Design a protein around this nucleic acid. Structure first.
Lengths: 98, 78, 94, 109, 97, 78, 109, 94
DNA sequence: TCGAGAATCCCGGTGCCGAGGCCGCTCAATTGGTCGTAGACAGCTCTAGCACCGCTTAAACGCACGTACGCGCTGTCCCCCGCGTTTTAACCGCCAAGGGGATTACTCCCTAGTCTCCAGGCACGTGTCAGATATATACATCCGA
DNA sequence: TCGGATGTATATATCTGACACGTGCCTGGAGACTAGGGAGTAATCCCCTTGGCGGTTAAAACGCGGGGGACAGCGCGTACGTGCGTTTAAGCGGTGCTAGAGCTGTCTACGACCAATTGAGCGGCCTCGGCACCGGGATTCTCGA
């Protein structure tokens, strides 16, 4: 009979793995394409330095990680362990972004 | 259609660093919209700085100033 | 005895153009004074930072326009830019 | 013979003062030198914002059968607009109050 | 006896108090509290009359905003009563703790 | 003197906030939060008063102290 | 006969530069004139804060068997304190990561 | 070719005093540069506003001390004030 | 409470590229005088902040009852997690072209600083009308039979 | 569904004090002039950004099975809302004293500015050891009988 872990074990293993490293977690080329697509709506034929895209990606990852940290607190307050769109909405409303 | 380059595994890695144990299936579409709004806000100010400087290239200093103007100071790029 | 200054005269003159039959109280006048001073400080500080960034030593209408574009949201920015451009053009024309 | 004086506001077609703005810019330690069109631009922008706020407040005051304007009217005008509430989102207006709002789940069945 | 049901007078008071603009705390106790807190930083201090008014206005506005956030947290928990845990969550998300 | 802030006053503040039912342990927490906020503002106000070499605290000092913490107040000079 | 030169930092007993800080204060449009002791005071404060942060970061670096200091060590030193964490609360450090933290409700029974 | 300036030498001198056998990398050195610039700008702005409030035209060690007290929390402010006072006394002794 | 399995930790060796020190040199910081104003100190005038006493009444306090809301326990089902297989595109290395960022001269128009002269805006006093306040309806909303 | 009870909106009359407006005056803004350097424009150089091509392979996408977590429902009990009777202290008015804020006049020390002079800090080279990677074995945590 094959070996299987119970649900939740590998999730905690990944939490421990990623809370210890410091590397980026999104793909460079798709992120660059997205930045260049967004930039077209304000000016045409723009150029980007190499370090500008790195700075943008760093800021974006930090922002999303903080947002998820607050969403988890909302979900636990509701007596749950699964996060939800309403949790994200409540966190943003209290932070004042909406 | 470049917002689809941000994939479900990458969103899951970000959540795992945030400390989330279980995720529902409707989170990804919401996260994509949040990111799009944030990026629009920062990039508009960066382009305004570039246009005042009379350049055709966005630099790292423009991004740093744009982030600082929004209460999001960043270290290690200038 | 030293004397103070405010924007009460100009606020009243503006109000008499949009509502020729309305008054104002002292508390409301003080609130309007605070509003004007705060917006002035915001715009001036942003223009100073721009001049420092671009290694210039003069504050000009280009700096004021960029500061307005950075600070005001949406249609307010468009209308403010139009008013400023028209005023400067009229001032130069004379 | 010297020609008759003529204020800078009159030749700019404004109601806010240009000379006082120029003096405040010069004595505010913002730069080493100040150009000639900057006070005109700043005065025009300030006047436009004042006019917008005053129009909304006057409408609010007339809605509830009053002749004068009070801080309650100013607060209502500021909070009911979408851009002004974004511009003044960290500002407290004394003797202003709050907007009426009750959540849907609290009303009786 | 003409008892109203629980919850009617509360809504009536909400409607009454979201329409006025006056202060809701007693001025003499607030002044005494301000002086008592101030005496720890410096002795023999005097206050202008408008300084205490400014302090009171700021305090009331801050408390009203905090209660507004607490209500949303309590509703999110599928309740109608507010508890200290709701205030704690609101402050933690706002970043004051 | 913190006991001079009464249960009816806290109830009025909560009603203006828009709440319907209040638990019995809210009042002590509210008193603590108010005390912390007041200490934080008054410390800066007294620092401003001491720098100008005065014995009186003024509305200008209170307004500056409020502005330093992102709580700008209109209607008392400025 | 001009006497031998002597830096202001040496007279103050400091390692951070005083003349450069004086020039930066003069050319920053902060005031009309600058006193003589202000650059000395400011340099002393800056040196103190740098020394504190570096001591903590070096302890963090030695804790994990390294000789050099890296952004991860800087982040750990800043976040594990209480006062530096309050002074640098709205700041993002590149290549720093987060503090290990798991909620107790999520742990297995 | 223009040449730029930074605080790397002074940061290194400070490091060799508190940890005589530890090095540093380039990314960490950049982070330290950003830290020093940020604190400098904060304190200078606070002093400028104080001098403007008191209707003065000079920035002094008293203004710097008050700005430090307003900006730093708890024990950090006390230690920084002591360091600055000792440095000024030693400089004025010679 | 024990065995099997999968994952993580420890350790010895190789190899390379980035931190760390040295050299020339040029530009910014130091030293020595001179000058004019900003700020420090004393003296005086008068605002306003503090302390007290009597009284009227509106708010606070305390108690009793009951109803509705919070919270625990059960059962169902469907959705999200773990794992194996196939597919796709990200990443690295290397070539090639040219758009544009950056620096150096040259020249001129705009802004700072003075001096004279006058009108705009501030302090102050005065009269009347908008709004506050009391009383009497008239009407809308809740509650139990 | 409806009558009884209670709270709230509306109209009329009457007072009162704050707002809107003259009036005198004084200082700050405008008109006219001069001088010097900040910035606008043209030319040149070389760096760094963009585009293409191929190979390897790690990550992404898809399908299946099952277990546990979300959610609706029911029941019990006690905590908070509402109303009434007694007590306390805030708000208002008026007196009275002096501490300290605010302004003015003298005078002197300190910061700005300019001209010689020299050494500290930056850019450009080299070079060796701290760390990154690989492979092998040891220990630990999880899961089912």
């Amino acid at each position: 009979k094959p070996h299987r872990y119970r649900p939740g074990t590998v999730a905690l293993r990944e939490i421990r793995r990623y809370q210890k490293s410091t590397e980026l977690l999104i793909r460079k080329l798709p992120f660059q394409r997205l930045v260049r697509e967004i930039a077209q709506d304000f000016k045409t034929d723009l150029r980007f330095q190499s370090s500008a895209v790195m700075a943008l990606q760093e800021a974006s990852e930090a922002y999303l990680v903080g947002l998820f940290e607050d969403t988890n607190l909302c979900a636990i307050h509701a007596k749950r362990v699964t996060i939800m769109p309403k949790d994200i909405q409540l966190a943003r409303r209290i932070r004042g972004e909406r | 259609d470049n917002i689809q380059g941000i994939t479900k595994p990458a969103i899951r890695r970000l959540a795992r660093r945030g400390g989330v144990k279980r995720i529902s299936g409707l989170i990804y579409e919401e996260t994509r919209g949040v990111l799009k709004v944030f990026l629009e806000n920062v990039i508009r100010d960066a382009v305004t700085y570039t246009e005042h400087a009379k350049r055709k290239t966005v630099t790292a200093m423009d991004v740093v100033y744009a982030l600082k103007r929004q209460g999001r100071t960043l270290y290690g790029f200038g | 005895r030293s004397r103070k200054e405010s924007y009460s005269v100009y606020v009243y003159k503006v109000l008499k153009q949009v509502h020729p039959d309305t008054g104002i109280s002292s508390k409301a006048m003080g609130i309007m004074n605070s509003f004007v001073n705060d917006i002035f400080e915001r715009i001036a500080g942003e223009a100073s930072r721009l001049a420092h960034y671009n290694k210039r030593s003069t504050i000009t209408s280009r700096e004021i326009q960029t500061a307005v574009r950075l600070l005001l949201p949406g249609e307010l920015a468009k209308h403010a830019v139009s008013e400023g451009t028209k005023a400067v053009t009229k001032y130069t024309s004379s | 013979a010297r020609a008759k004086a003529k204020t800078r506001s009159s030749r700019a077609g404004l109601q806010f003062p240009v000379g006082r703005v120029h003096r405040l810019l010069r004595k505010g330690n913002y730069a080493e030198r100040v150009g000639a069109g900057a006070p005109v631009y700043l005065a025009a922008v300030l006047e436009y914002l004042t006019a917008e706020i005053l129009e909304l407040a006057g409408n609010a005051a007339r809605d509830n059968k009053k002749t004068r304007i009070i801080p309650r009217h100013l607060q209502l005008a500021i909070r009911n607009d979408e851009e002004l509430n974004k511009l003044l989102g960290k500002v407290t207006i004394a003797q202003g109050g709050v907007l009426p709002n009750i959540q849907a789940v609290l009303l009786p069945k």
